[PDB]
């Protein structure tokens, strides 16, 4: 069932096979460069986002 | 293991899984064209924002009255639960797309919110609209057809998944039409 | 000195004048909808936004001047 | 002193201000409430304003991005990114406190013998600078084309002349 609690599963892909590493970010095993984090995480509400669609829905992207 | 995606929709510690090396290989070779599949995956995550925003825009746009007093997305109030909607709807397509099936998408997202809509006067119509511009955004990055933006990726045919994440779209539109 | 650690001050603006408020956001003394928030973080390097960077240079976007 | 203790805090750990306390931060300084929604443009377009600047920089002289090049690699790309987001948000603190001191302190003194030292190009940090400041006058006037700012109307000239200041500080460092 939907459950009401504005839960969602938040996907992050990384491909990270030209090397470049930031400290304390190994969390999986793996050498080949690839990764999946996968979260459940409450969608927060976002009131920029909001108020700017408010302002500017009528124009198309440029 | 195979369930490591799948344990997160159902666990309660709160917890990310990370999947790689050998595992992430399992995953990817579990469903059809895992690598091409991952940057589909990731087409729709590191463009979420600007899919949800220009899908929920181009509904008001096509509809005013949604934004007038009375109508569905009037104060900033009703309209951030819109754009929060279409994300999160948005996630569920991106992990129907991770995962090769729909079965968490219509388990969890789906069954019961169509109700929910109706009892909230939350329009039938415009979420139609906000969902087939999603569909049309995310096929476009898929298939090299974004003008402002392209995938960095080698070139070649992604038909077939834009094929597969459209079908998870539908799956939405059937359940709340 | 700049101190190369990456580290710049990160202001957040907030008008809640409309009265929505969510739980657990109250964070100073104040009735009047207006808050600022700033921070001290290292910003960090956001692979995708480069690896689009180098992709896509080449568009002009938001009606912008050339 | 509230914000100004967290540019020195050892964990730069958040402060909020609000109530009497922001009234009467905004009465110190010039236009407050224009001040904040200028504030608020700068930092809620944060991601755009960077990556159109230094977008441009490439545009106008592809070879950054050519081996050898200033932004050649991810890598290198990144770092330029993330300068560019820096310098932005100290930009934006100057704007909210109403003076330069902290921009010319912990962001730009050393910067150009640091830039000198790795071969960081000046003059696509020039160019990178010049944008950031056309696009952030560009929300403050009225001129952006793509997405404009949700204020009353009304004039915010004065403010966007003293955020322009704010970065021909940050381009004579560099130059
Ligand atoms: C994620 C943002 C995008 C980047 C970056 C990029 O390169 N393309 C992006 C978005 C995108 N949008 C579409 C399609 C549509 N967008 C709208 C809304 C727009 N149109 C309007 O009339 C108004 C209101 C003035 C808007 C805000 C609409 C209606 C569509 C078409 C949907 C359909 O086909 O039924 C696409 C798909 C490719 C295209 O350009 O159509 C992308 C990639
Ligand atoms: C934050 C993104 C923006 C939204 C949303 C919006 O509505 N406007 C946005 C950005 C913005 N950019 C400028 C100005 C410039 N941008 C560039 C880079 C662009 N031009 C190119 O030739 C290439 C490469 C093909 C680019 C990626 C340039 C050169 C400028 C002009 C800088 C100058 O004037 O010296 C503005 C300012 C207003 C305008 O549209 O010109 C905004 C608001
Ligand atoms: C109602 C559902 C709104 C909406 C509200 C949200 N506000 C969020 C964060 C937030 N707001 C403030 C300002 C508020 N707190 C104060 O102490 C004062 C004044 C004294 C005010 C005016 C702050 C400081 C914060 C951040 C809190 C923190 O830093 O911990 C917020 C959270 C967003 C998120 O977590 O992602 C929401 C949802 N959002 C909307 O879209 C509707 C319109
Ligand atoms: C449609 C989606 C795209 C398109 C995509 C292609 N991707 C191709 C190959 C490919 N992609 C990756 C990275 C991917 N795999 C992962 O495990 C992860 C992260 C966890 C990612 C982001 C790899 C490793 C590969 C294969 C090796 C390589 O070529 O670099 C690809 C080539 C065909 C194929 O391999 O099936 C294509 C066509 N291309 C397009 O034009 C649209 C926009
Ligand atoms: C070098 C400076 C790059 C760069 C790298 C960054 N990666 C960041 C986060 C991150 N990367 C991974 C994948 C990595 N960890 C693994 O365990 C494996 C495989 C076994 C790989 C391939 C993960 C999982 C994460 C996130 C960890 C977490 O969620 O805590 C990252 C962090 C960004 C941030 O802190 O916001 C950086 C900087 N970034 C760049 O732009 C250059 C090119
Ligand atoms: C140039 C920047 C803009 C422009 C801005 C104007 N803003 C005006 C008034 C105004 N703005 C706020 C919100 C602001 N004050 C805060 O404390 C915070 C958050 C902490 C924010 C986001 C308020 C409260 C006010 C005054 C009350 C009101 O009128 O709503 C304004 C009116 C003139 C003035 O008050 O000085 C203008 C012109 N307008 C533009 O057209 C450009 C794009
Ligand atoms: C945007 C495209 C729509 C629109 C959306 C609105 N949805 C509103 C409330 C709402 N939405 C949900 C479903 C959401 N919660 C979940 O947990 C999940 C999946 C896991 C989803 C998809 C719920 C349960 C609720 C009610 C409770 C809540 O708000 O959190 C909403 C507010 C309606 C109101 O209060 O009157 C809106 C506006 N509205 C539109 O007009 C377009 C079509
Ligand atoms: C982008 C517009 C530039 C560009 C930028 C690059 N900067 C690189 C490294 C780098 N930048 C800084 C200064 C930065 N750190 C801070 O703490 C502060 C302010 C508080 C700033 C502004 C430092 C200290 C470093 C080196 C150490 C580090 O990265 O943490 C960089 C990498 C260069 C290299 O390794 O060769 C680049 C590419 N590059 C360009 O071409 C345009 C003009």
Same mark, same amino acid.
């Given at each position: 069932?939907?459950?009401?609690?504005?839960?969602?599963?938040?996907?992050?892909?990384?491909?990270?096979?030209?090397?470049?590493?930031?400290? =304390?970010?190994?969390?999986?095993? =793996?050498?080949? =460069?690839?990764?999946?984090?996968?979260?459940?995480?409450?969608?927060?509400?976002?009131?920029?986002?909001?108020?700017?669609?408010?302002?500017?829905?009528?124009?198309?992207?440029? | 293991?195979?369930?490591? &995606?799948?344990?997160?929709?159902?666990?309660? !510690? $709160?917890? +990310?899984?990370?999947?790689?090396?050998?595992?992430?290989?399992?995953?990817?070779? &579990?469903? @059809?064209? $895992?690598?091409? *599949?991952?940057?589909?995956?990731?087409?729709?995550?590191?463009?979420?924002?600007?899919?949800?925003?220009?899908?929920?825009?181009?509904?008001? /746009?096509?509809?005013? @009255?949604?934004?007038?007093?009375?109508?569905?997305?009037?104060?900033?109030?009703?309209?951030? +639960? /819109?754009? *929060?909607? +279409? %994300?999160?709807?948005? *996630? #569920?397509?991106?992990?129907?797309?991770?995962?090769? !099936? @729909?079965?968490?998408?219509?388990?969890? /997202?789906?069954?019961?919110?169509? %109700?929910?809509?109706?009892?909230?006067?939350?329009?039938?119509?415009?979420? +139609? *609209?906000?969902?087939?511009?999603?569909?049309?955004?995310?096929?476009? &990055?898929?298939?090299?057809?974004?003008?402002?933006?392209?995938?960095?990726?080698?070139? $070649?045919?992604?038909?077939?998944?834009?094929? %597969?994440?459209?079908? #998870? &779209? !539908?799956?939405?539109?059937?359940?709340?039409?």
């Amino acid at each position: 069932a939907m459950k009401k609690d504005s839960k969602a599963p938040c996907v992050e892909v990384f491909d990270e096979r030209d090397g470049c590493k930031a400290a =304390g970010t190994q969390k999986a095993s =793996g050498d080949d =460069g690839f990764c999946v984090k996968v979260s459940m995480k409450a969608i927060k509400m976002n009131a920029a986002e909001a108020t700017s669609v408010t302002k500017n829905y009528n124009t198309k992207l440029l | 293991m195979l369930d490591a &995606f799948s344990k997160v929709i159902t666990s309660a !510690d $709160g917890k +990310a899984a990370y999947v790689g090396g050998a595992d992430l290989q399992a995953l990817k070779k &579990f469903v @059809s064209e $895992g690598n091409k *599949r991952m940057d589909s995956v990731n087409a729709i995550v590191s463009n979420a924002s600007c899919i949800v925003s220009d899908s929920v825009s181009g509904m008001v /746009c096509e509809n005013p @009255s949604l934004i007038a007093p009375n109508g569905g997305v009037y104060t900033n109030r009703k309209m951030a +639960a /819109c754009l *929060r909607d +279409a %994300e999160i709807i948005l *996630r #569920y397509v991106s992990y129907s797309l991770l995962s090769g !099936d @729909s079965s968490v998408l219509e388990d969890r /997202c789906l069954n019961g919110l169509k %109700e929910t809509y109706a009892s909230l006067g939350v329009p039938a119509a415009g979420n +139609a *609209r906000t969902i087939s511009i999603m569909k049309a955004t995310v096929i476009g &990055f898929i298939t090299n057809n974004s003008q402002q933006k392209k995938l960095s990726t080698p070139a $070649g045919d992604c038909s077939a998944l834009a094929s %597969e994440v459209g079908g #998870y &779209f !539908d799956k939405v539109s059937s359940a709340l039409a």
